[PDB]
Design a protein around this ligand. Structure first.
Ligand SMILES: Nc1ncnc2c1ncn2[C@@H]1O[C@H](COP(=O)(O)OP(=O)(O)OP(=O)(O)O)[C@@H](O)[C@H]1O
Ligand SMILES: Nc1ncnc2c1ncn2[C@@H]1O[C@H](COP(=O)(O)OP(=O)(O)OP(=O)(O)O)[C@@H](O)[C@H]1O
Ligand SMILES: [K+]
Ligand SMILES: [Mg+2]
Ligand SMILES: [Mg+2]
Ligand SMILES: [Mg+2]
Lengths: 405, 386, 351, 591, 199
DNA sequence: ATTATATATATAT
DNA sequence: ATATATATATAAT
């Protein structure tokens, strides 16, 4: 159906405010009590919140939404968003604050002696909330001037200000300087994924569920029931265990559900256990084994020689002349007269491997050395070599015999 | 005009992921594959077929971060409808929302396909996370594609990023290559006549090449040689063992000559239609680089692992030992040593000092030395090893 | 209520008019500046210490009391300048700021330097001496060299965080970190007339912070958050609330991040530990760690790991800084170091 | 003034009115012999040099064969783009020689040839100002303009603007010098916009054409269409039209010739250094000889004889060639010449025409001898006109025994071979007109008119032997030869190439040679000359050995501080580098 | 022994004083031949044993008295080809600016020389074999300076292996004229900086 | 492979 | 146009 695809494509791709919170309640309480205290009083506080995909932008957006429904709040609060990937300098960062506070007409051509004097005139023309998304890249500026000026204006000035800080770094209080550390109230909120696998199974049913404001109720009843029957199936639980064994992040699950929904149309109205099984295979693909399947026959013959070099002269780099000499014994003695190709063609096979980056320079110096006699290292492990040879579509008989021997 | 052959299921994955126009797709898809497996062709034809407003950008072309941003911006402003300038990535995101709010583009899925993605990492550290998370940043219903030839785990930055859903274009097999090549027929001959030519051509050339681009070019050039016995009248279309025996030895010379670009394709079409002190000093460095210093005294006074760097005081000592005459240490003979370096026949290593920097190497092959030795009537073989 | 005035008092911005425990330094600064203002002579001062001592507040009380003495006609009147190093965009902008503060005219930095050199009862204040450093060290040197001239009649006060600073330039009054007694005096001093805290919480907070660092802002924030966690349990702020607060602001979340991890990343960390036991070094390539990790996944019973998935596992562990890894542009050559100690990892994985 | 904590010491003549400059040739006048002789010698030098530069450049222009093939290739490859993918960029690989210096004219000459025939836009790039892709493209767009962050879309927009048809030609002078990265990038970007930007690339290659494979890998080398194009022959022509013609008055001796030929064949092929060599010799010849104003065109040289200073007339009298010439004469003729300068003037005007007519006689017989010589197999005297010129200038050829074996070989030629030889020899006489050998041209035509073979053949052999004995003769046996000749062999040799290391090696081992004051016959030496000969090296013992020697030769510490300076002098020279195996252990001479 | 000792230790007697006092005049004869050959497109390097700076400074006092000459000392420790370019481009032209590149500055110098023939500059280099100027790029900048017609150059090399810094393309940029000038005065000023780095 | 110096561009004075 | 910060190249560790 059209509207089901619309709602869960907004839910899983363009990640959107939804009411459900799993295992972040005390964290939500501390953040809410803080923004309430900063938004109502003249109090100022600072926060450093969690690894990737752990719902950092989820939790703040609900809280500001919940705060904004208060009629007194919505009249007299101004928000400013700054991301650490967009604004990599304080000059770019200072321009955004004048624009987002709608004071770009007010400031005009006025000249300010200092960075703080520019920020001081802005605030004096009603609390203000600052949100600093992806905070660890603000802390790699030259002198952390934006970090100091936001904390100092919070700690001393009367104007109420909140500095919420969003990072992925557990060692976040070792990249900041001493003086900013002293002005930072050490208020840590931890949205770490502390929930179990039975709790992980319950989330699987709830996120793949249509809401109650859906018009056509009779399809919505049987769709919700069909989720309930599949949620208890043993077949879905083995691949759900595999993905839970990799990661407890819900973004990997939202990757799984979109590809399983990809196979639902008017001809296939309800999901099947086969669809989730087929969805698991695409995400679990191994990248390096796929490339070796698509190499040429001669390109396979080089890497087995390069495998054979690292078992004798262990952890020692090798050049082309190491490789070509090893290849010559296999053509003249081990196998047969065919594949005794010339020296200029085998160069292309080596020059195509380095283009695909299965082989990396030990030392990179362009122009200093020749195409041959350049020390090179194999980036492909021995485990991936033997498995890929077995699944090669028509691998020649003696070539695989050389690989084992 | 353009038809995709033996790419059905992968394509169906692409329009399945695309969906309808108002729907929100993945923020980032990263497509990886070999040298020719329909990365450019399938994606470009599929975006043009559905009339989805899309921008195709080569990354190698735009060598500067700046060049890449207006190239996306200008091409989208043609699609909606003078010159928009943006320097940093922040001004790109602000202006991208400005161009997308036009009436044709407010409720559709705008695509930015990028080709040759292995160079984007060298440009800047924060560019590659910028495009992967672009739909969350811009909030304008955007999908970004990544055409590349390298696996995803190399692309991953150290600090982490949004993860793209990884697809694979599968390699063409030996039958799969055959159907694509036997589609664009030459009109004057039959359909089964051209297929048997493809059958024998892949007989020689599948071993060294599974590239579609190379084999199609090799198929065009040797086709006049294949069809000349029937034109002369010795054979017919049903005399297959006549036709394959004419092209049999001809193709085993194409692999050495045309395939390695020694004789160019322009020549190969026409060929069937027509039916003193510098000489010693390079020898001296070759004896300097490729010999141990312990046996130096034995050879003169009375190759694998590559070059070994040598001092100049060893070099000049060998030079006076092989020239059977008094040689003055003139300015030119010291000027002539560094003429070989700038000509790349020699190379200095280290660069610690220049006049008191004795280090050099002899970067030239064995065959180049044996003719110069033969020119001046000198025996390079006698001094190399016993 | 009762607690809301405790929040109002405990706020860092509410500096008191009379500061406890910094009265001798107040008098000594006051005597040095009164020995230099009344006789119309130019001198120099340097002050340093750890950031939490209270330098700016005490010298601001100094400049206020001289201003009040100036209003009462006790001393000849003085015009006042204050500049902070962190706030400025550029190190050379000090000259243009001193120029506009003293005179109406504005100029470029080198023109301002020449006008200030030609110009020299003004009382300079320079916080944050460290960031005005240049490889010329010209700004630092002429900041010391300007007031020592009869035309100048300038007194310079300086604030920094390393005491051994003005030797490398080619007196040093000092401020000490707070101990138990001064800190407990401050904490009772802000809540002198409100019955809101128990003294056992006061001594635990003061003892903990003076044991760790010796800062004031840390104490005021731990007390303000302790009032919050007491307000959840509804009074009187007991020992339990402050004990919960002190390990809500001082405990490290490295080990609890290790606890709540998935199965395969913990297996990866166990593989790192085992490979370090086998080697004895701090350096181990990604191939060596993976060669142990496949054996661990074999023995535990996990499905056999692909390397393009263990690479994602290693990148996720590096992104949260539990490991130290190279950027992944090279693969199979990633030498890994444990960012955390072996004992914390063995404490976290055992349960 | 030259010493401060800085590296710039420029002096300026400001604040004083000396804006007027000193004209050139005021420094030429080093010895006061005549003031006005020097000005005329410098004018004759300038005229002869500009003539030899013009006839160098015109001859290098004539040696058109190469450009005809390249112009045809340029038009043919663009005929495909005229008709209209994966088009290969057509490229031309010009193999220029090892003579790196010569390439500037060779690349310079090709510019106006292409600019006149096929294309109006030809530009040149060098690696010295192209390190990266931003710099490689910025230089290209600026040179394209006359004939903002520009890109390849800037190139295509410019091309549509100015054409509203012809190809753009871009030549790379030194492909060895270019970095690998920028070459691999430029080929790929240009190929995908071949539809709106037609590009054809010419590469200046110096080495054999295998350099393309090393710099450019196979994945890029198949996007090009490589076609190949291609000093000993250039040198023989330029020697003939500068020295073996009578149009230029100046000549050189055999030892001066031997010096200049040896730097070319042995060290490095460079015809511009040969041009450099004779330009110094022309400068040195009008400097050492005062009466070298007579080295000009012959009607002017007789005019110069008429008006002279009296010291110049005495200067004419003291030539060794002149002194040998007056001695052979009668008794009365000697006192006729020595006393009266007017009788000297008329005799000299005859002798310069005897000098001039001989040089008209000389080479036009050498050209005929080569036509015999190059026909003969096994080439005894030489196969080249440069080699044959050397062996007869040094000494008479028949007086050497090498010429007799040539005569014995020349007797054994068949009838057909002689018909080719005497056809060419008669053609040589017709080629150079106003030749002073009339009867000979007739008898070479009479021998051709004649066509018992063996008896007439010996006349044909004895034709050439008598002729060369008349005219081939070394010019040291001719009076007033010095007026157009220069023999300072060591003076030219050391100036072009000398040996600094033997200047170091001789002086240290032998103090006596530049201080001829019994300083050495087989201790007493300057400070660098004692410490050198001691070593040919731990510094404590090396200090003792110096302290042993210098005290023998001559509370002080004078001897120890000398050891400090005269080893730090030596490590400034290329001898001493400190090491850590001992306190010092180094030997960088070993020769 | 410490370096301070030599300043009071100025009591060394030359042994063969009379005969070395003869080779300053004989090489003073060769001044005018050099001064001839500079104007016509050649260049001079002095090759020998001794300290050629004495004959070079003797050449300045006698000859270049009414010219815009420059003296370059490579034996100075903090010397660069950057400094050699900066001396000309700020003082000789009377220009007051900075340049983005050594190559762009070199282009501005060569183009300003090509525009006007009225300027003549004499580029004296006492030591070109010092390790700062030993660079092929530095010698390339000096050779692109040297090839012009309105600029002149005298040089001296002390090193045993000194022609390493010229190949065939640079032996064409410098039109060298080689001169045996072996005075036997000792290296005094240029050994001063080197005396520090050992005992 | 990283760190230091030189250099190329960009930005602020 | 001077000066400084950032980016890239070359050189040394
Ligand atoms: N406990 C949870 N409750 C509800 N939703 C969750 C929870 N954990 C994860 N999610 C979902 O996973 C996604 C998390 O990504 P989100 O955009 O919120 O920020 P993030 O990716 O954690 O932060 P960053 O982008 O800075 O790494 C959201 O769509 C969210 O709905
Ligand atoms: N399904 C198909 N049917 C017909 N032709 C095809 C098909 N797939 C690819 N081709 C042809 O193969 C050629 C090369 O394919 P493509 O341009 O996708 O290479 P590529 O993989 O993008 O190259 P690279 O890996 O270097 O980026 C195209 O010119 C196209 O005509
Ligand atoms: K010159
Ligand atoms: Mg987020
Ligand atoms: Mg492609
Ligand atoms: Mg302070």
């Amino acid at each position: 159906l059209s509207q089901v695809q619309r709602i869960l494509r907004e839910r899983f791709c363009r990640q959107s405010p939804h009411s459900n919170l799993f295992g972040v309640q005390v964290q939500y309480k501390h953040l809410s009590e803080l923004l309430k205290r900063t938004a109502l009083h003249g109090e100022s506080n600072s926060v450093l919140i969690g690894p990737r995909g752990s719902g950092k932008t989820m939790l703040i957006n609900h809280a500001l939404k919940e705060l904004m429904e208060i009629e007194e709040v919505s009249e007299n609060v101004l928000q400013v968003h700054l991301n650490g990937l967009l604004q990599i300098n304080d000059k770019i960062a200072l321009k955004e604050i004048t624009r987002q506070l709608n004071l770009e007409n007010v400031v005009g051509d006025k000249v300010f002696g200092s960075f703080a004097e520019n920020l001081s005139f802005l605030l004096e023309a009603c609390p203000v909330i600052f949100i600093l998304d992806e905070f660890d890249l603000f802390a790699h500026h030259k002198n952390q001037t934006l970090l100091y000026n936001l904390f100092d204006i919070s700690q001393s000035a009367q104007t109420p200000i909140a500095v919420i800080g969003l990072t992925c770094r557990l060692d976040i209080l070792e990249l900041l300087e001493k003086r900013v550390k002293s002005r930072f109230s050490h208020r840590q909120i931890h949205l770490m994924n502390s929930f179990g696998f039975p709790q992980y199974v319950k989330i699987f049913k709830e996120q793949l569920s249509l809401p109650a404001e859906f018009p056509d109720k009779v399809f919505a009843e049987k769709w919700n029931e069909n989720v309930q029957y599949l949620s208890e199936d043993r077949s879905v639980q083995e691949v759900l265990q595999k993905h839970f064994n990799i990661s407890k992040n819900l973004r990997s699950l939202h990757m799984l559900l979109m590809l399983a929904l990809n196979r639902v149309t008017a001809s296939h109205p309800f999901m099947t256990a086969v669809d989730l099984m087929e969805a698991s295979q695409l995400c679990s693909m191994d990248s390096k084994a796929n490339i070796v399947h698509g190499l040429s026959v001669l390109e396979i013959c080089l890497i087995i020689a390069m495998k054979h070099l690292n078992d004798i002269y262990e952890e020692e780099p090798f050049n082309f002349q190491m490789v070509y000499n090893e290849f010559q014994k296999f053509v003249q003695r081990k196998a047969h007269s065919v594949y005794n190709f010339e020296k200029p063609v085998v160069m292309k096979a080596f020059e195509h491997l380095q283009q695909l980056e299965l082989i990396k320079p030990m030392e990179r110096t362009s122009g200093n050395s020749q195409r041959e006699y350049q020390l090179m290292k194999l980036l492909l492990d021995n485990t991936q070599i033997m498995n890929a040879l077995q699944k090669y579509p028509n691998c020649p008989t003696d070539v695989r015999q050389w690989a084992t021997s | 005009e353009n038809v995709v052959l033996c790419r059905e299921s992968q394509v169906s994955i692409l329009q399945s992921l695309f969906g309808e126009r108002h729907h929100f797709s993945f923020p980032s898809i990263f497509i990886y594959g070999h040298t020719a497996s329909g990365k450019t062709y399938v994606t470009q034809t599929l975006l043009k077929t559905l009339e989805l407003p899309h921008v195709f950008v080569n990354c190698v072309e735009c060598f500067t971060l700046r060049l890449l941003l207006e190239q996306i911006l200008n091409k989208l402003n043609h699609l909606s409808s003078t010159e928009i300038t943006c320097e940093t990535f922040n001004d790109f995101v602000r202006l991208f929302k400005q161009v997308t709010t036009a009436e044709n583009l407010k409720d559709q899925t705008v695509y930015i396909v990028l080709d040759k993605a292995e160079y984007l990492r060298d440009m800047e550290a924060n560019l590659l996370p910028g495009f992967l998370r672009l739909q969350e940043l811009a909030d304008r219903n955007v999908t970004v594609l990544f055409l590349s030839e390298i696996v995803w785990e190399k692309f991953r930055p150290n600090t982490g990023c949004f993860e793209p859903f990884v697809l694979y274009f599968p390699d063409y097999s030996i039958g799969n290559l055959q159907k694509i090549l036997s589609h664009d027929h030459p009109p004057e001959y039959s359909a089964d006549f051209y297929a048997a030519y493809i059958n024998i051509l892949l007989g020689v050339f599948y071993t060294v090449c599974r590239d579609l681009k190379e084999l199609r070019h090799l198929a065009v050039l040797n086709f006049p040689k294949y069809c000349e016995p029937v034109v002369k009248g010795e054979a017919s279309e049903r005399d297959t063992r006549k036709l394959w025996r004419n092209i049999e030895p001809h193709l085993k010379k194409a692999m050495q000559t045309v395939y390695l670009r020694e004789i160019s394709s322009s020549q190969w079409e026409k060929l069937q239609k027509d039916d003193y002190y510098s000489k010693f000093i390079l020898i001296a460095a070759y004896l300097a680089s490729y010999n141990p210093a312990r046996t130096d005294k034995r050879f003169f006074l009375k190759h694998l692992l590559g070059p070994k760097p040598f001092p100049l005081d060893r070099l000049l000592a060998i030079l006076y030992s092989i020239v059977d005459s008094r040689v003055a240490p003139t300015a030119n003979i010291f000027s002539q040593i560094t003429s070989l370096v700038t000509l790349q026949l020699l190379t200095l290593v280290g660069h610690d000092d220049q006049l008191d920097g004795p280090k050099y190497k002899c970067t030239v092959s064995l065959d180049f030395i044996r003719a110069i030795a033969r020119t001046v009537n000198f025996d390079i073989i006698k001094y190399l090893y016993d | 209520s009762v607690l809301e005035e405790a929040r109002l008092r405990l706020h860092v911005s509410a500096v008191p008019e009379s500061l406890p425990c910094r009265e001798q330094e107040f008098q000594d600064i006051y005597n040095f500046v009164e020995s230099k203002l009344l006789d119309h002579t130019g001198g120099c001062m340097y002050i340093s210490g750890v950031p939490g001592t209270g330098k700016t507040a005490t010298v601001h009380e100094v400049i206020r009391c001289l201003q009040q003495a100036a209003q009462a006609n006790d001393v000849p009147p003085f015009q006042y300048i204050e500049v902070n190093g962190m706030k400025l965009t550029e190190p050379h902008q000090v000259y243009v700021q001193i120029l506009q503060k003293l005179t109406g005219q504005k100029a470029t930095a080198n023109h301002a330097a020449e006008l200030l050199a030609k110009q020299f009862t003004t009382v300079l204040l320079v916080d944050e001496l460290d960031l005005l450093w240049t490889h010329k060290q010209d700004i630092m040197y002429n900041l010391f060299d300007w007031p020592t001239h009869k035309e100048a009649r300038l007194v310079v006060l300086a604030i920094a965080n390393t005491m051994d600073l003005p030797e490398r330039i080619m007196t040093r009054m000092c401020f000490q970190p707070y101990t138990y007694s001064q800190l407990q005096q401050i904490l009772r001093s802000r809540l002198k007339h409100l019955k809101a805290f128990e003294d056992d919480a006061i001594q635990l907070v003061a003892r903990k912070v003076a044991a760790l660092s010796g800062d004031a802002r840390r104490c005021l924030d731990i007390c303000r958050r302790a009032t919050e966690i007491c307000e959840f349990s509804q009074g009187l702020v007991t020992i339990a609330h402050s004990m919960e607060a002190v390990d809500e602001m001082f405990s490290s979340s490295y080990i609890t991040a290790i606890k709540n991890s998935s199965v395969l990343e913990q297996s990866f960390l166990r593989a790192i530990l085992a490979e370090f036991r086998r080697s004895g070094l701090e350096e181990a390539t990604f191939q060596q760690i993976y060669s142990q990790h496949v054996a661990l996944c074999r023995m535990e019973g996990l499905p056999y790991p692909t390397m393009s998935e263990t690479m994602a596992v290693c990148s996720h562990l590096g992104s949260c800084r539990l490991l130290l890894v190279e950027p992944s542009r090279n693969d199979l050559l990633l030498r890994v170091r444990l960012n955390v100690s072996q004992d914390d990892v063995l404490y976290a994985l055992k349960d | 003034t030259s010493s401060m904590s800085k590296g710039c010491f420029v002096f300026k003549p400001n604040s004083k009115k000396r804006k007027i400059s000193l004209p050139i040739e005021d420094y030429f006048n080093k010895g006061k012999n005549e003031p006005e002789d020097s000005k005329l010698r410098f004018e004759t030098y300038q005229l002869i040099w500009q003539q030899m530069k013009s006839e160098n450049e015109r001859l290098q222009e004539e040696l058109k064969n190469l450009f005809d093939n390249l112009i045809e290739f340029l038009q043919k490859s663009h005929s495909g783009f005229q008709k209209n993918k994966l088009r290969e960029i057509p490229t031309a690989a010009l193999v220029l020689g090892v003579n790196v210096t010569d390439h500037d004219l060779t690349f310079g000459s090709l510019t106006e040839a292409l600019q006149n025939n096929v294309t109006p836009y030809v530009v040149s790039l060098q690696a010295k100002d192209c390190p990266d892709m931003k710099h490689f493209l910025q230089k290209l767009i600026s040179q394209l303009m006359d004939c903002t962050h520009y890109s390849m879309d800037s190139l295509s927009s410019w091309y549509m603007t100015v054409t509203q048809s012809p190809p753009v030609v871009v030549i790379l002078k030194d492909m060895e010098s270019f970095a690998t990265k920028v070459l691999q990038d430029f080929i790929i970007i240009s190929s995908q916009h071949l539809h709106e930007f037609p590009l054809i690339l010419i590469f200046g290659i110096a080495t054999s054409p295998i350099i393309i494979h090393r710099l450019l890998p196979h994945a890029v080398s198949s996007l090009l269409c490589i076609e190949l194009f291609q000093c000993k022959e250039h040198l023989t022509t330029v020697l003939d039209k500068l020295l073996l013609t009578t149009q230029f008055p100046f000549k050189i001796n055999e030892k001066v010739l031997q010096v200049l030929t040896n730097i070319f064949l042995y060290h490095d092929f460079s015809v511009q250094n040969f041009i450099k060599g004779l330009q110094l010799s022309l400068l040195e010849h009008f400097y050492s000889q005062p009466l070298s104003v007579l080295c000009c065109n012959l009607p002017e040289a007789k005019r110069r004889i008429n008006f002279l200073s009296n010291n110049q007339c005495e200067n004419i009298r003291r030539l060794p060639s002149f002194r040998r010439y007056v001695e052979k004469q009668a008794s009365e003729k000697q006192v006729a010449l020595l006393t009266n300068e007017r009788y000297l003037k008329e005799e000299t005007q005859l002798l310069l025409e005897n000098l001039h007519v001989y040089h008209m006689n000389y080479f036009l017989v050498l050209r005929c001898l080569h036509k015999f010589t190059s026909s003969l197999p096994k080439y005894p005297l030489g196969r080249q006109i440069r080699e044959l010129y050397c062996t007869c200038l040094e000494k008479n050829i028949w007086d050497s025994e090498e010429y007799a074996s040539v005569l014995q070989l020349l007797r054994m030629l068949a009838k057909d071979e002689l018909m080719t030889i005497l056809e060419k020899c008669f053609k040589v006489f017709k080629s150079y007109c106003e030749n002073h050998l009339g009867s000979t041209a007739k008898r070479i035509e009479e021998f051709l008119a004649q066509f018992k073979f063996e008896v007439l053949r010996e006349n044909v052999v004895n034709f050439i032997d008598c002729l060369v004995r008349e005219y081939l003769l070394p010019p040291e046996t001719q009076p007033l030869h010095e007026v157009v000749y220069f023999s300072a062999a060591h003076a030219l040799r050391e100036h072009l190439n000398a040996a600094p290391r033997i200047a170091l090696h001789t002086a240290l081992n032998n103090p006596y040679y530049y201080l001829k004051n019994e300083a050495l016959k087989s201790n007493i030496a300057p400070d660098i000359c004692i410490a050198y000969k001691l070593h040919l090296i731990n510094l404590v013992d090396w200090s003792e050995a110096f302290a042993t020697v210098v005290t023998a030769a001559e509370m002080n510490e004078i001897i120890h501080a000398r050891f400090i300076r005269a080893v730090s002098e030596l490590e400034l020279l290329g001898f001493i580098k400190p090491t850590k195996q001992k306190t010092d252990h180094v030997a960088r001479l070993t020769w | 022994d410490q370096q301070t000792l030599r300043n009071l230790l100025s009591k060394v007697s030359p042994s063969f004083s009379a005969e070395l006092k003869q080779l300053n005049q004989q090489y003073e004869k060769l001044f005018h031949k050099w001064m001839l050959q500079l104007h016509l497109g050649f260049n001079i390097v002095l090759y020998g044993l001794g300290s050629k700076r004495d004959l070079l400074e003797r050449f300045r006092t006698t000859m270049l008295q009414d010219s815009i000459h420059v003296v370059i000392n490579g034996f100075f420790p903090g010397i660069s080809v950057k400094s050699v370019l900066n001396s000309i481009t700020e003082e000789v032209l009377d220009h007051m600016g900075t340049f983005r590149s050594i190559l762009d500055q070199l282009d501005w110098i060569v183009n300003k020389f090509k525009e006007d023939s009225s300027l003549e500059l004499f580029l004296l280099i006492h030591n070109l074999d010092s390790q700062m100027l030993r660079g092929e790029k530095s010698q390339q900048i000096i050779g692109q300076l040297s090839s012009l017609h309105n600029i002149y150059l005298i040089a001296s090399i002390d090193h045993l292996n000194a022609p390493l810094m010229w190949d065939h393309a640079k032996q064409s940029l410098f039109n060298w004229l080689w001169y045996e000038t072996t005075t036997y005065s000792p290296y005094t000023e240029e050994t001063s900086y080197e005396n520090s780095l050992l005992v």
